[PDB]
Design a binder for this molecule. Structure first.
Ligand SMILES: [Zn+2]
Lengths: 21, 30, 30, 21, 30, 21
């Protein structure tokens, strides 16, 4: 998921908006 | 908002900021 | 409680949570 | 000690219970 | 005060402690 | 700057005193 990319590659806060309720 | 390299605890912490009172799910590949 | 990889500041921070008002000693090999 | 392992290898919170007063 | 290895968020955090109400500038090579 | 060294090498709090207002 994001855990994978946010650490191995890079992510954006708008992508982290996906994991919210 | 730029491209962030977020690992470990720093990641669920960024979720806290981005979601707040909405809440979130922390699902890392197990 | 699972297996944690804790380095640097994140370590004394985990001690804060695990010990609290009991207190702790932070002794890294010097 | 734990500083060494908790970082180089891995440790458990019950092992961190050893460093409390 | 000893020699610290400070990276990422841990760095602006050390600035918060060292400067406080004086304020600071965070200028990383872009 | 310090961002570079504080991470690539090592820095001291007295050097971080330089970035204050
Ligand atoms: Zn960290």
């Amino acid at each position: 998921g994001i855990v994978e990319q946010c650490c191995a590659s890079v992510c954006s806060l708008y992508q982290l908006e996906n994991y919210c309720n | 908002f730029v491209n962030q390299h977020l690992c470990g605890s720093h990641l669920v912490e960024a979720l806290y900021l981005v979601c707040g009172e909405r809440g979130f799910f922390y699902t890392p590949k197990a």
